[PDB]
């Protein structure tokens, strides 16, 4: 998101350093290229921020995972345990 | 973005006195800094990512108490 406006910015900024025009269009493109910068700046540091959340969502999901699936095959060991009481107990009833 | 208010200080105070002209020198740092540089779409999906990790959180520690 910021980086193509921060890229179309610079580019801008360039084509009008290329080529005074009333020191009106240089001081736009350098205000535009520094706004860029900026966001461009600010865009890395959410980045990044964004990263090590999803690392420490990652590996909280994961363990999440790793506790669901132990309890999933305990419960289906469990369930299997009361399935065979259950039939030997309708069995032994009579 | 000091590169490009760089330059033009060194364009206006070399405009009569053109001894060293860094007008092209200038001109292609800033188009490679501009192509190795490369909206609130990276905030806002950062806030979603940091409430989905405070919801698993708070998921991973509702199963805390647990004695059979």
């Known amino acids: ?94 | 973005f000091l590169p490009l208010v760089h330059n033009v200080i060194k364009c206006m105070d070399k405009d009569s006195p053109d001894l060293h002209q860094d007008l092209n020198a200038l001109k292609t740092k800033f188009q490679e800094l501009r192509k190795l540089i490369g909206p609130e779409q990276q905030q806002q999906q950062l806030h979603s990512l940091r409430e989905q990790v405070r919801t698993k959180n708070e998921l991973l520690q509702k199963y805390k108490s647990l004695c059979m």
């Not at chain 1, 009333?22 to 493109?29: A, H, M, P």
């Not at chain 1, 999803?54 to 095959?73: F, G, P, T, W």
């Open chain 1, 1 to 94: 998101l910021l980086s193509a406006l921060e890229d179309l910015e610079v580019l801008s900024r360039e084509l009008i350093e290329m080529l005074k025009l009333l020191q009106l269009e240089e001081e736009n493109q350098v205000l535009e290229l520094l706004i860029h910068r900026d966001g461009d700046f600010q865009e890395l540091m959410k980045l990044a921020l964004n990263q090590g959340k999803v690392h420490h969502e990652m590996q909280a999901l994961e363990k999440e995972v790793e506790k669901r699936d132990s309890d999933i095959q305990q419960l289906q060991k469990q369930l299997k345990e009361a399935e065979q009481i259950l039939a030997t107990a309708v069995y032994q009833a009579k």
